[PDB]
Design a protein around this nucleic acid. Structure first.
Ligand SMILES: Cc1cn([C@H]2CC[C@@H](COP(=O)(O)OP(=O)(O)OP(=O)(O)O)O2)c(=O)[nH]c1=O
Ligand SMILES: [Mg+2]
Ligand code: NA
Length: 319
DNA sequence: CGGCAATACTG
DNA sequence: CAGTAT
DNA sequence: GCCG
């Protein structure tokens, strides 16, 4: 991890992000990652360009941090950024909402609470603003999973529950708990969703709903007892036939998925949480114009294999 | 020049 | 649809 | 921002 010009770049990328410059922020994220994967501290401008993800623009800046020890660009970052970052850390609020609030004169969570127009979701976010920024100890993620699993298996022992996301990637802490559910039957997943949620509300485990779709649930839970914070909980239910892909998707990491999906595209294939497809027809702009065929994928290894990739353990997918 | 993953919910 | 979220 |  020899890299600490990135600290200065992190700031820039994060500023570009809150400000809405999606793609410029992506560029940075790539480079800011590359530099962290580079064994040897970067010495020369040419050594910079040599790394995938770093071009001339980025190189020049990496050079200014070596010679000057500072970064001129950081000096001229708008004063709105900290405020925008503050607002866009409200669940249900992104760059568009954050910028509007700022343009309307709001500067603090206090301003937001008393004067801002909040959606149902955002009101819930503000209400847990501090909790939603905290990562839980891995061991708490476990209890949460077991709580859901136990409640799901209650009215159907056949059901299958798996904690994915950072948890399955074996991370020490977890932003939220990502619980994937399916059934070997491939038909019992039918609407059991509702019964499970209602049940978890009863015991007071689920405190708030943010999203309730046919197959996706985003909510807020809390385990009983003292010293418990509110934790974000995500649950998806999927047909058994889509299990492998769902698992692969819901495990991540995000950058891993985007990478794997970009690779699939180059091969005229397509990857979603539903399936790996082939014979996928696309126009000039990368958009889909032809569906193609679904490829059989009983396990995650099938996906890797079908893409001509060596299998990778969840822990290895962590970017 | 122009894509940078692909999907689900909300209102 | 635009915005936000995984 | 980077890259084909
Ligand atoms: C955000 C995002 C996520 N995914 C997938 C892959 C990961 C899981 C879990 O999402 P999460 O934010 O909890 O990330 P997680 O790995 O669980 O790390 P945390 O402990 O939650 O911060 O969803 C994706 O395909 N595209 C995206 O933009
Ligand atoms: Mg998580
Ligand atoms: Na947010």
């Amino acid at each position: 991890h020899n890299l600490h010009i990135t600290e200065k770049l992190e700031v820039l990328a994060k500023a570009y992000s809150v400000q809405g410059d999606k793609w410029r922020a992506l560029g940075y994220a790539k480079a800011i990652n590359a530099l962290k994967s580079f064994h040897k501290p970067v010495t020369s401008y040419q050594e910079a360009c040599s790394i995938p993800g770093i071009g001339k623009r980025m190189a020049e800046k990496i050079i200014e941090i070596l010679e000057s020890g500072h970064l001129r660009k950081l000096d001229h970052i708008s004063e709105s950024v900290p405020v925008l970052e503050l607002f866009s850390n409200i669940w249900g609020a992104g760059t568009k909402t954050a910028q509007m609030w700022y343009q309307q004169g709001f500067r603090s969570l206090e301003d937001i609470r008393s004067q801002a127009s909040l959606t149902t979701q955002q009101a819930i976010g503000l209400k847990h603003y501090s909790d939603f920024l905290e990562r839980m100890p891995r061991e708490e993620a476990t209890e949460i999973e077991q709580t859901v699993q136990k409640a799901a298996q209650a009215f159907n022992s056949g059901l299958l529950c798996v904690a994915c996301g950072s948890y399955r990637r074996g991370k020490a802490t977890c932003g939220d708990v990502d619980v994937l559910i399916t059934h070997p039957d491939g038909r019992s997943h039918r609407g059991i969703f509702s019964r499970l949620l209602d049940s978890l509300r009863q015991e007071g485990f689920l405190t708030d709903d943010l999203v309730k779709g046919e197959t996706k649930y985003l909510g807020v839970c809390r385990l009983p007892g003292p010293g418990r914070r509110h934790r974000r909980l995500d649950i998806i239910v999927v047909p058994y036939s889509e299990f492998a892909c769902a698992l692969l998707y819901f495990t991540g990491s995000a950058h891993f998925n985007r990478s794997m999906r970009a690779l699939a595209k180059t091969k005229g294939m397509s990857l979603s949480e539903h399936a790996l497809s082939t014979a996928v027809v696309r126009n000039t702009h990368g958009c889909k114009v032809g569906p193609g065929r679904v490829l059989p994928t009983p396990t995650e290894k099938d996906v890797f294999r079908l893409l001509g990739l060596p299998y990778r353990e969840p822990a290895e997918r962590d970017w």
